Amino acid sequence: GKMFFVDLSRCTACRGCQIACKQWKNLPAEETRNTGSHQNPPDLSYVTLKTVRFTEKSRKGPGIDWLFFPEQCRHCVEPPCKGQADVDLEGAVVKDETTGAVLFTELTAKVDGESVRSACPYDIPRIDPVTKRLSKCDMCNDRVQNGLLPACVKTCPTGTMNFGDEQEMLALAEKRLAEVKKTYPGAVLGDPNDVRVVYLFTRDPKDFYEHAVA
């Protein structure tokens, strides 16, 4: 199946990926306000499948460590969300075994959405308060079936986003981790044997986001 390798050592927080996800799906915008941060929307929601999270950490001397995290579903190799949805109604969460995508259907409206979110160790699923349907990143599975890159991977200007076959992408992830560790000694890959969205964090993943890793 497929895999993303996300080299966060290259990310400029341009939010090209955040906008591209919405343009490809023609998703609506949220009502947002500035509460003292560039981050917005503040969280994933039913209409926001990817948001870039901004975290500032103090460093000695001028400047800071500014940590950017373009969050999305990790397309788990064995997704707990599906195990939980299947308790209430099969067919709410299905797999594409060719691409590796984990896919929510409109039958999510008939499962316990809060339980499905609770089952996700990455706190990814989001429920529509009106329909009770669940949404998240769907790996741009139809683009991928048609031999294209996911919208957020194609759009990325910096080579942060990478996509391809799992063997090539895990080899790339390990090669890049070894290089980036020359500058960022606490660099780590996120849950690389469990997920299909493999982040290279430049420091403790929890500094990027509370649910960055399981």
Partner: protein, 972 residues
């Protein structure tokens, strides 16, 4: 097949936002017959390779936008409502207003008795957002109507770059191009936030770093750029010259300069006259009563042949390089640290890393933009970095140059087409009142008697004659010369520019304004003055995509529509993906783009709006007669249209030029109607037309070279990423300017692994050579009178070397460099109050951008995905200032200056720290200028309520990057 893209036609386009020039793929429903359904990146484009930042990625939302104008609107005097009107009503009535105003204001002769043939009661602003063919046609319409007050974005953007780099190198443009950044060994980003404002540039920046480059960001703020650089150093707003002069001192003291490059290719050896001096912050020739320098005091000592004297031994005390060492000896690390706030340790670190590029086989580049230009010393900031690059041999080389990052998609092109008061297309000066004949106009061009000096501007008579033939093909150039308006020779040039246009408007001296693709109610410094001044117009024509703060200034904050007599016409134009034409990116790449969907609703491309309006003026003159109609009636507009609409293709071919008669030139035979193959084949005798000599070579008998999408490259070209067969760059496809400076006297590259040009088997291989001639036969800066990179540049209004002056509103009333506090010839308006070490306005104010919004936000405040990301005006402050003022993160604050005030959301961050200036912490307040009162709800208004209408004496750019403010918590 993807359902979304079924039965949709694919076309290519170029991003309508920044001057990176990223490629797009547009899908249009019903095989081209419906609306856009998808816009994303062009995977084949050599600059972006399919990538798009959030602005390019949201073009679909801009184009398919229910808030867009649908048809013309009309606001009667004293009305509080728009009335929808027809195009025919709108343009018939606009023609009446233009003609009434022109017939009443037209001046044949000025008070001195000199011919000027000008209309002083109409001004025009705009626009770098229009296609190149539209910009060229627009400027020609305005000049045929007799206008001189013709300005656009460039004035308030990169205006100081042009004289700064032309003084230094001979041309004003960005010297290299985006792909070339990946060749650099050391990238200094300073006065630029490129990861936010040129995002796809960071593809190439990070590729440089992958290949071992050091990335350095010097900025008052820690930004999204800073996060990805190896070295981040703070600098106080307005303290660039201390930093840069300190690096000049460092390079000279440590002998880190490229000796042979400096001796041969710079003016280091030229001898400056005895009349040159500098004391206590003033150069020789200062006239205190008139606040002006006599620049004749700064002249070179000339030999008996009238060529500047040279001492190749670099020993004469009046050699440029010895006067340079003497000037910068004051810029020691302790004084530079004390005025910049930058630690001595970080100065040494940056200086060591950057000055290491003075090695012949190493290349350093500078990426700068508004952090340097938007100052009262903008020209001198840029001059200092140009001088550094010359000392280090970085000009003309791959991975080097001065990458002056242009802003709008076509601000390079709109400048090239002369939408500024002082220039015709192709940088031929607008005539002044003393140039009574075409002979007198041409006699002003400097000549050289140095046989190694190409002095290419000696070809100007060919370009002015070919331009006059493009406009008035039935007339001899000498006769057509009398049709075009002239500026008064007696006046400061800045009297004709943006800030003085608004001052005149506030005094009631303008009847009409075209706000053509600009939002001056938000984008102009001191926006309260602008908003009040527009109510003194009789009429305003606003051409734009949406209703906005300029169209609707009469119902803005504090305004009473019932007291405001201005008649307003709002004319809705097309978005970029709805028309065809070219845009010239920051590397001078002129890229052709195609229509996807038809124009939305009843919107029109600018070319049709301006052509239809002009034809209605011509028809009204035929009906009535009026003031000197010839320039209007005779203008060649037949060549601008096909099938009764504006023709991008025909206008582009006219800009390139064609032969009006069979001609022999350069011993080649040409036929009537053939395209001119390059500017080398233009003539002064009326045989050739060319709307813009820089375009001669863009659209030849071979076809539209701007439309080339060929990534074929020779091995030498691919090694450095020239892509010479991808689109076309002026001049004649020279991708890296000044590239003769990249080789020794035998034509061998300084840096063979990154050769730009190389003399191989009797020819220059690689880039197009910038100036023909065998190796060692010519000075490498062919557009300079004398041929050299100018370390000493005596044409600038405040002197031949940069010198630190504080911003006109500043936190200190001391200057450690000299007694002289402020730029002694600065552009300023008497009566306008300035906060100089005023405890009522104790904080540095500066304004800047975020990745997700564009310009005044007129476009992006309408795009819900971009508003979602950045919904409101914010105020960035340090933790230390937040503590001093009792401001919490997210609190509402009021920022105030002598000129206005506004509310914003506080962003309290360690990304900003105090600047320790002579031992005293100085706090800054940062604001984005992307917000305005019309939209969105709770978005906030323009930071330009706060900024000063004062700035650079060379170009009149306002000091929007360094002024003074207060901030206070709001309890609401």
């Amino acid at each position: 097949e993807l359902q979304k893209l079924q039965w949709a036609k694919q076309t290519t386009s170029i991003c309508c936002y920044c001057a990176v020039g990223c490629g797009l793929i547009v899908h249009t429903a019903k095989d081209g017959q419906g609306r856009a359904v998808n816009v994303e990146g062009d995977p084949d484009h050599p600059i972006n390779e399919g990538s798009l930042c959030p602005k390019g990625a949201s073009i679909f939302q801009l184009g398919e936008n229910d808030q867009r104008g649908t048809q013309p609107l009309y606001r009667a005097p004293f009305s509080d409502t728009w009335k929808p009107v027809t195009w025919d009503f709108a343009l018939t009535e606009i023609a009446k207003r233009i003609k009434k105003t022109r017939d009443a204001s037209f001046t044949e002769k000025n008070a001195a008795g000199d011919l000027v043939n000008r209309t002083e009661a109409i001004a025009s602003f705009g626009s770098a957002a229009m296609d190149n063919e539209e910009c060229w046609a627009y400027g020609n319409i305005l000049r045929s109507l007799g206008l001189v007050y013709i300005e656009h974005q460039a004035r308030i953007x990169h205006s100081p770059t042009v004289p700064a780099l032309a003084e230094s190198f001979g041309r004003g443009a960005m010297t290299n191009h985006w792909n070339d950044l990946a060749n650099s060994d050391c990238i200094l980003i300073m006065g630029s936030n490129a990861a936010e404002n040129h995002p796809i540039a960071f593809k190439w920046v990070l590729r440089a770093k992958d290949k071992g480059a050091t990335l350095i960001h010097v900025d008052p703020r820690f930004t999204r750029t800073s996060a990805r650089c190896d070295v981040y150093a703070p600098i106080r707003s307005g303290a660039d010259i201390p930093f840069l002069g300190g690096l000049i001192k460092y390079i000279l003291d440590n002998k880190l300069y490229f000796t042979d490059y400096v001796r041969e290719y710079t003016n280091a050896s030229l001898i400056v006259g005895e009349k040159f001096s500098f004391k206590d912050g003033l150069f020789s020739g200062y006239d205190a009563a008139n606040k002006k320098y006599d620049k004749s005091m700064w002249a070179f000592e000339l030999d008996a042949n009238g060529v500047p004297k040279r001492d190749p031994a670099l020993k004469h005390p009046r050699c440029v390089i010895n006067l340079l060492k003497k000037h910068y000896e004051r810029y020691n690390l302790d004084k530079v640290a004390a005025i910049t706030g930058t630690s001595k340790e970080q100065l040494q670190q940056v200086y060591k890393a950057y000055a290491a590029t003075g090695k012949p086989d190493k290349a350093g580049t500078i990426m700068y933009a508004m952090g340097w230009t938007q100052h009262s010393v903008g020209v001198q900031n840029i001059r200092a970095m140009a001088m550094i690059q010359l000392l280090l041999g970085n000009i003309g080389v791959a991975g080097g140059g001065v990458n002056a990052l242009r802003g709008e998609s076509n601000v390079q092109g709109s400048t090239d087409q002369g939408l500024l008061a002082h220039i015709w297309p192709g940088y031929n000066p607008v005539p002044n009142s003393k140039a009574a004949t075409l002979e007198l106009y041409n006699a002003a061009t400097p000549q050289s008697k140095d046989p190694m000096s190409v002095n290419w501007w000696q070809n100007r008579p060919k370009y002015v004659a070919s331009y006059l033939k493009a406009l008035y093909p039935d007339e001899e150039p000498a006769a057509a010369y009398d049709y075009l308006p002239r500026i008064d020779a007696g006046r400061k040039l800045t009297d004709y520019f943006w800030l003085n246009i608004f001052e005149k408007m506030d005094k009631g001296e303008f009847k009409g304004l075209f706000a053509w693709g600009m939002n001056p109610a938000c984008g102009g410094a001191n926006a309260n003055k602008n908003r009040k001044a527009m109510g003194k117009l009789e009429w305003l024509v606003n051409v734009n995509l949406f209703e906005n703060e300029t169209s609707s200034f009469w119902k803005g904050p504090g305004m009473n529509p019932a007291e405001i007599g201005t008649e307003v016409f709002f004319l809705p134009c097309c978005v970029s993906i709805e028309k065809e034409g070219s845009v010239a990116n920051s590397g001078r790449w002129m890229q052709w783009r195609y229509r996807g969907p038809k124009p939305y609703a009843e919107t029109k491309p600018d070319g049709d709006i301006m052509l239809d309006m002009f034809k209605k003026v011509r028809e009204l003159y035929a009906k009535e007669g009026g003031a000197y109609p010839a320039p209007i009636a005779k203008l060649n507009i037949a060549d601008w249209e096909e099938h009764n609409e504006f023709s991008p293709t025909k206008v582009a071919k006219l800009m390139n030029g064609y032969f009006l008669k069979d001609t022999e030139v350069g011993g080649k035979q040409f036929k009537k109607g053939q395209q001119v193959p390059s500017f080398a084949f233009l003539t002064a005798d009326g045989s050739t037309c060319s709307g813009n000599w820089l375009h001669a070579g863009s659209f030849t008998d071979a076809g539209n070279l701007m439309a080339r999408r060929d990534k074929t490259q020779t091995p030498e070209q691919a090694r450095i990423g020239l892509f010479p067969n991808w689109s076309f760059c002026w001049p004649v496809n020279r991708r890296i300017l000044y590239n003769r400076a990249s080789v020794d006297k035998t034509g061998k590259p300084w840096n063979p692994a990154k050769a730009v040009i190389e003399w191989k088997d009797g020819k220059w291989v690689g880039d197009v050579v910038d100036g023909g001639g065998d190796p060692g036969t010519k000075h490498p800066f062919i557009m300079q009178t004398h041929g050299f990179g100018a370390l000493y540049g005596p044409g600038r209004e405040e002197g031949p070397f940069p010198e630190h002056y504080e911003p006109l509103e500043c936190p200190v009333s001391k200057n450690p460099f000299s007694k002289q506090l402020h730029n002694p010839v600065a552009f300023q308006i008497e009566g306008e109050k300035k906060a100089v070490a005023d405890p009522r306005y104790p904080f540095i104010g500066t304004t800047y951008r975020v990745t997700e919004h564009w310009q005044t936000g007129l476009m992006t405040r309408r795009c819900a995905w971009l508003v979602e990301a950045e919904p409101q005006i914010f105020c960035e402050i340090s933790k230390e200032l937040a503590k001093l003022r009792g401001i919490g993160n997210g609190d509402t604050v009021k920022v105030s200056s002598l000129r206005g005030a506004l509310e914003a959301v506080a962003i309290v961050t360690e990304r900003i720290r105090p600047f320790k200036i002579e031992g005293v912490d100085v706090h800054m307040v940062g604001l984005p200028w992307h917000y305005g009162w019309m939209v969105p709800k709770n978005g906030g208004d323009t930071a330009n309520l706060l900024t000063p209408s004062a700035g650079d004496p060379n170009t009149g750019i306002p000091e929007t990057k360094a002024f003074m403010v207060d901030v206070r918590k709001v309890w609401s």
